[PDB]
Point group: C2
Chain length 187, copies 2
C-alpha cells in the first residue's frame, strides 16, 4: 500500500496556533440554547456576538488506530454568571478516549456519563487530563485570560454534539464568590 508521510509542525505555546492546521471559530451565536441565561445570551450576541473559542486541528481519515490532534483557544467571559465553555460532546464511537494537555491560563473540565454522573477536574498549565471511554466532556474557562490546551483523540472517534445540544450537561459551572459546580435546571 501507499504510506502517508510523517511530518513535524510547530505549536506556539503562547498563542496555541499550530502551523498548517485547519482553523474553526465558534461565536456565541453558534451556541444557541447552550447557556442557562438565554436573555443574557441574546443581549451579548446583539452587543457583539464575541468569539467563545477557536480550534486549530490536524485530522486524518476516520480509520481505526490513527490519531487526530488540535489546540483550542477558549476566551475568557461569562453569559450572566456562567463561564465561557466549549459545546461539549460524546464520541460517535462512544468508547474512544481522549487526552488533554493544558498549556496556558486556567479552567477545568466537566465530564459526565450517559446517566449524568458528573466530575469536574481543575486544570492549570501542565495539567494532563484523561477522558475515559464513554464520558462526554466540556472545557470551561474560569479565569480572565485565555485558556489554551491541546487535545489528542482517535481518528475514528467522531463527535456526537447532538445529545448535548438537546439536553446539555447535568451540571453548570458558575461564579458566586468563587467557582461553583451546581445542578443544571434544564438537564
Amino acid at each position: 500500500m501507499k504510506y502517508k508521510e510523517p511530518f513535524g509542525v510547530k505549536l506556539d505555546f503562547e498563542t496555541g496556533i499550530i502551523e498548517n492546521a485547519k482553523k474553526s471559530v465558534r461565536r456565541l451565536s453558534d451556541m444557541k440554547g447552550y447557556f442557562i441565561d438565554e436573555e443574557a445570551w441574546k443581549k451579548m450576541v446583539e452587543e457583539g456576538d464575541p468569539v467563545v473559542y477557536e480550534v486549530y486541528a490536524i485530522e486524518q481519515e476516520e480509520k481505526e488506530g490513527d490519531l487526530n490532534f488540535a489546540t483550542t483557544v477558549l476566551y475568557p467571559g461569562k453569559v450572566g454568571n456562567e463561564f465561557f465553555m466549549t459545546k461539549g460532546h460524546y464520541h460517535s464511537k462512544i468508547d474512544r478516549a481522549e487526552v488533554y494537555f493544558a498549556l496556558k491560563g486556567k479552567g477545568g473540565m466537566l465530564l459526565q456519563t450517559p446517566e449524568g454522573e458528573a466530575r469536574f477536574i481543575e486544570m492549570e498549565p501542565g495539567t494532563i487530563v484523561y477522558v475515559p471511554p464513554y464520558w462526554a466532556h466540556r472545557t470551561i474557562n474560569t479565569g480572565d485570560k485565555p485558556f489554551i490546551f491541546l487535545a489528542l483523540y482517535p481518528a475514528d472517534a467522531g463527535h456526537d454534539y447532538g445529545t448535548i445540544a438537546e439536553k446539555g450537561f447535568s451540571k453548570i459551572v458558575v461564579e458566586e464568590n468563587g467557582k461553583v459546580v451546581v445542578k443544571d435546571n434544564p438537564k
Copy 2:
C-alpha cells in the same frame, strides 16, 4: 466506567505526577549501536542511563489511549548519538503523536520497504508518526531532550524486528548532525 483524572506534568523535568517510571541503560541496549567496542567500554565504565520514561497506560483495548514522557539524556556510543531502542507497533496499523517539550533532537522513522525519514524536533514541535512506520527518538544535543508521546492503548510493541534488522540509517556527529546509511 473508568475514572477520569488529572495529573501534573512538570515542564522542566518532564516528570508526570503518579506515573510509572522506568530506566534503560546501555547494558539494556546490547546490539543497538554500531561501534560494538565503544559499547563494551562504556558499559564497563559503569553503563550510564540512556533514557527514563514516565508512563500512564490503560489496558490493551481498541479506541483507548496511553501517554508518557521520555527523558533522553545526552551522549554518544562512538559518534552515534544517544537514542531509544525504537520499534514497530504490534498492530502496525497504529499511529503516534509526539510533542517536544525541552532540549533538541529528532525522530527517525522507517517503512518495511526501506524508506527512512528524519524529522528535527525542538520545543513546540509536534511530530505525526503515521501508521506502519517504525520510529526511534534521537538526542542530538548536550542537554536532556524531553518529550510527551501519545499512542493507541492497543498499539503494542515489537522490538524484535528492529532489534535484529535495526534502522536503515544511523545518526552521528561530524562537526554537525549527520544522517547516514547503516549496516
